[PDB]
């Protein structure tokens, strides 16, 4: 979970958060989408034809061993006010996070490198 926290901190450096369906499909048809954390089997196979199609297209695109939980992702992440910092708010926000611009900080990020090394 520390890798998720440090990549959340990296996205908190970058802060261009386009966490939506239309911006995600725009990043899918352009060459920008490299780390998207998206839940697969939730709503009658909504997105899993094209995101997995362009995933199995010859690019890496998957630093995912297991998708993080949609109930707690965006509200352990950065979204909103102070927003129940000590009251443990776990309400559904965007629940899909993209990490932009080559997704790599300095030498302490070898764990994400060995994440997208394998399939």
């Amino acid at each position: 979970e520390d890798a998720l926290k440090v990549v959340l901190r990296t996205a908190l450096v970058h802060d261009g958060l386009a966490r939506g369906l239309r911006e995600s499909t725009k990043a899918l048809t352009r060459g920008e989408a490299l780390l998207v954390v998206l839940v697969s089997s939730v709503t009658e196979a909504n997105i899993i034809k094209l995101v997995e199609g362009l995933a199995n297209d010859p690019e890496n695109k998957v630093p995912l061993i297991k998708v993080a939980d949609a109930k707690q992702l965006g509200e352990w992440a950065g979204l909103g006010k102070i927003d129940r910092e000590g009251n443990a708010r776990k309400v559904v926000g965007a629940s899909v996070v993209v990490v932009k611009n080559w997704g790599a900080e300095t030498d302490e990020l070898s764990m994400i490198m060995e994440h997208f090394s394998q399939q």
Binding site: G78, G80, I82, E85
Partner: protein, 228 residues
């Protein structure tokens, strides 16, 4: 000469402003229609296709990571708090003299707290109140409903049997009327309808029976409305 000079100066100057306004509007239509869909000809010629910021984002991340609160809206002195209490006292006194001159649906409260005898009602009803008003984002009819059924609950409890624990019933109903008055100091417009309905039905009760339709819960109904 002064009146005509002022009227002529203001009329000619408003005419100047009218010329500037009408010329600006006509030129606005001309420039808008001349460069709105015609700059898609020059949208074919040329195209154009974090230190302290990251410190600020780090501090905003720490602020989202942990936060706390401050007490209540102000801080007041002893004599100033006494002055506000004295203003409330004199307000209530003169307003009273001007007046004198001129989760609970009638069984759900009992069906909820119907386990123990005397003490569980006070703590459980205070928790019901503090659990409705805390996350009450719209709960007003629920508020009115449990005030209504706590009225009805002290009514059908204060004359069932007090030949059990007299001291325990004494302290639990003193607690119930005191919490009742401290919360119904603010909520009369749900309480008064149920008081009037109890009046309206117990009149028919006394109409039917000569004496044996009067509870002794009517007495504490009189006393708690007289204290409210």
């Amino acid at each position: 000469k002064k009146t005509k000079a002022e009227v002529m100066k203001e009329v000619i100057a408003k005419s100047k402003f009218y010329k500037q306004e009408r010329q600006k509007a006509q030129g606005i239509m001309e420039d808008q229609i001349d460069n709105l869909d015609d700059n898609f000809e020059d949208v074919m010629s040329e195209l154009m296709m974090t230190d302290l910021d990251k410190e600020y984002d780090i501090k905003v991340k720490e602020l989202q990571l942990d936060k706390r609160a401050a007490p209540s809206d102000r801080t007041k002195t002893e004599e100033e708090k006494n002055a506000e209490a004295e203003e409330k006292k004199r307000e209530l006194e003169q307003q009273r003299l001007d007046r004198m001159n001129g989760r609970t649906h009638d069984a759900l409260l009992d069906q909820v707290k119907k386990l123990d005898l005397d003490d569980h009602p006070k703590i459980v009803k205070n928790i019901i109140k503090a659990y409705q008003p805390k996350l009450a984002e719209g709960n007003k009819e629920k508020l009115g409903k449990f005030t209504a059924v706590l009225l009805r609950h002290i009514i059908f409890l204060s004359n069932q049997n007090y030949l059990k624990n007299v001291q325990s019933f004494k302290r639990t109903q003193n607690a119930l009327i005191s919490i009742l008055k401290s919360l119904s100091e603010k909520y009369n417009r749900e309480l008064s309808e149920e008081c009037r309905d109890y009046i309206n039905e117990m009149q028919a009760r006394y109409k039917k029976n000569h004496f044996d339709a009067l509870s002794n819960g009517d007495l504490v109904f009189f006393s708690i409305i007289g204290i409210l």
